[PDB]
Each structure stands twice: as structure tokens, then as C-alpha cells.
Amino acid sequence: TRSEYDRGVNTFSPEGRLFQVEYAIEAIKLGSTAIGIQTSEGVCLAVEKRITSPLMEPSSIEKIVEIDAHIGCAMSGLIADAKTLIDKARVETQNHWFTYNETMTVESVTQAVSNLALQFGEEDAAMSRPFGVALLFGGVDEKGPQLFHMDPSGTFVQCDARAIGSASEGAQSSLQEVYHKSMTLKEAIKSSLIILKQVMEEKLNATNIELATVQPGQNFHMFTKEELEEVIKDI
């Protein structure tokens, strides 16, 4: 019976559900897992890079990207939708800086990206299907470090610690167990890397992960091979 109520994004099922939106939410899973953690010292993003074969130089699997000098976006889903939404986020941050001569709040930028993702089939904007990608915006603003999760349905919500991607269900419980409100950035990094090792196919070693941090201070930083090895030494 679920074959006539999901031919279009603008068709309601008897349960009053947007099955196409639900289907895109399901599509979210295919991507590699990402974990973001908020702490009073900042926010940390760690993503399981999923190199399908070596000889692929790592600077093309962009699961963590930079939004302005104060936010980082972790992606899970279609690379095309990832690129489109990342471009929108960057353009919106720069436009807000140009207009109001300030730095957009993480909540505001996530809201703008969600506003772009809202337009499903509205004949007034031209995408026609949900953006099969889930994003984690971790940044620093006047309200202290913050982290937000946005899903294809345009819904965004604050999250002091969240995980998305293929290892979403298995990592959410680990985050719940290991999370106490007060940590340090190093503690969050260690916990996130431990969870990644728990829910990663490969042995966690130097490459195959990416780690980024935004702190009330130095701008968004991508940990290089040296720091990655240093942390992996005593995860």
C-alpha cells in the first residue's frame, strides 16, 4: 500500500506523513559516521573518513569543512547536497557579515541553511526533493560554544553532543553514557575518538578519521597528521 503515497514530496499518506521526507532521512544513514561534542571550552567534531581505496589523496573527502572563522560543519550524506548546503552557509555568513558587520551566530546560520533546505516543491524559488544530508554546525559565538544538528526535513536543534551517519544509533547511546555536562576539549576529543574506534570498520590509525575543533580563541582548526597521531597515541 506504500506505493502511491510516496511518488511525490507533496503527497500526504493516511498516517499524515511525508514519506519522501522520511525516505531522505533514511538515506542519511548511508554516509560515514560523525560525532560533534559541545563543552564549556569549545566544540569538537570527529568524522570517520571512509576512504574506499588508497591512492585517493585525503584532501577530497570533505566531511568537515569551515564556515567563516568561527564555525565548522560536519556532513553525512550525499556529497552534492553537502556541497550545495555548504555553499549556502558560507554565502549567508558572508552576507550577514557584510550587512551587519558582525559574525552570524551558529543558531542563525543553521537556521539559514534550514531555510534553504525547506523549499521542497514550492513553485516559488530549483530543488524538488529533500537534501539527503545531515549537518552538524559546531561554532563559537557570544553565547559561548554551541553545536546544532540539522536534518533533511529542515529541522535544526541544539545538541550538547550528537552523532549522525551510519553509526548514529550505535553512537548515540555511547554519547549518552559517556556525557557529563562539564568536560574539557581534550576530554571530548578522547571520548569521541574512543567512540569512533568502537564503531569504525578499520583500525583507528592516523588517517581514516578527521578531527576539528572550534574554541573561544583560536579559529576553527583542523588537526593535522602530527596532532592526530599524538591523540591516537593515548586515546
Binding site: 503527497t11 499524515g16 529542515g154 550528537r162
Partner: protein, 237 residues
Amino acid sequence: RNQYDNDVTVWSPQGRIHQIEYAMEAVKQGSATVGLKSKTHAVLVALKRAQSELAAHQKKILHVDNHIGISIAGLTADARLLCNFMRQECLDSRFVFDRPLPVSRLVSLIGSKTQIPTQRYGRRPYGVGLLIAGYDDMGPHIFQTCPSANYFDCRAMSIGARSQSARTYLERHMSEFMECNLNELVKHGLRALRETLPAEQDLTTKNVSIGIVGKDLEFTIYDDDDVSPFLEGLEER
């Protein structure tokens, strides 16, 4: 059925449209909210959901122009679109007429806007039920608007999943209204939401959202610790 509910533009062979009914059912897929008013105050109280214990609670009450707020029950997308439309309309009304927009006219415009998609196959019906609590020169107003472009002027109403219990409570206690202070009004609303909630749980400062407007009182939203003065004094079952 099975061939008369594939789009909103086709009449079923019974004098009914099935997509509109499907939207009016989807409206009941959201968290419970209720609203009501005294002779000098209008209030909304709603149960903001938590997707997970880690993730904070998604916001519920949306702050339309200072003399108006709304509570949503339905698709986040349609809720955001309608909230933006409300804000733009109120700003335009304030810009052209140097005075706030009447809530009746606001809800009429919303009804027409939500009706137009219910006829032409160009977009699905707006899947959200709205409780608009506003204050105009006439006095506090509580309005309901449903995806079927039907809007009612309600003295005390509930919407969302498990709204029957709150509606029954409001029916029983409507006699009290119109002669209650703001504290008693919020207590009435909180009791209605407690009744609609299942027994083993309760209302916590974390998960309850309150919004009040009235005389010389622009719309104010209380959440988290802000609601403590209400819950603390609220009586227990």
C-alpha cells in the same frame, strides 16, 4: 479510496476530499499544546518535545509581532513558512498603518493563504495546526487554524496529539475563565496540560513552554527556569 486520495484536486465519490483529511490527521501527529484567555490576558502553554536527552528541546512558541504569538502542531517546514508569513504581514501592516494588525484579519489572511494550496495541484496543504494568541484593542483573542483552511475563534482550545483530555478539562473549567488573575490562568493551562500528559510523567521546567500577552504586556515567552514561578506554585494531583 486508493484512487481518490492521490492528490488534493480530485473529489472522492462521497463529497469529501481525502488529502485535506490526511492533513487534518497529520496535525494530530505533533506534541500537545493548548491556549486560553481571561478578560485581560491570553496565554498558550505547550509541551516542547525532546528528540533525545542530549539534544535540547525544540522550540514551540513562535513570537509573531510583539502583540501576537503562535503555537504550532505540524510539519516544521509549514510551521516556519506560516510563521514567516505572519511576521511579514504584521510588519507590513505596522509599516502602512501605524498600529498593530488585528488578530482576526491576520487569521483571515492565514486562512486564505492555506486554502489556496488546498485547490490547485501545485503544492500540498499546509500541514500545521496553529493556536494564535494575540491582544488587540478589542481584547485578548485565541484563534485556531487547521490545514483545511478552517479557522475558529476559541475561548479555550487544545491541539496536537492527545488533545481530547485537555479539551474536556477546558470544557469543565470554562466557567472559571474571564474572572481569573494571570497566575490562575496559567495554573488552569498547566492543569490542562498535566491532564493531557500521561500519569507516570509530569511537567518540568525543561520541557514546558509558556507564552502570555495582554494589557500593557507585549508577548512574553517563558521556558526553562523562566516557568519556575508557575510550576512551583502549581498544585499537585
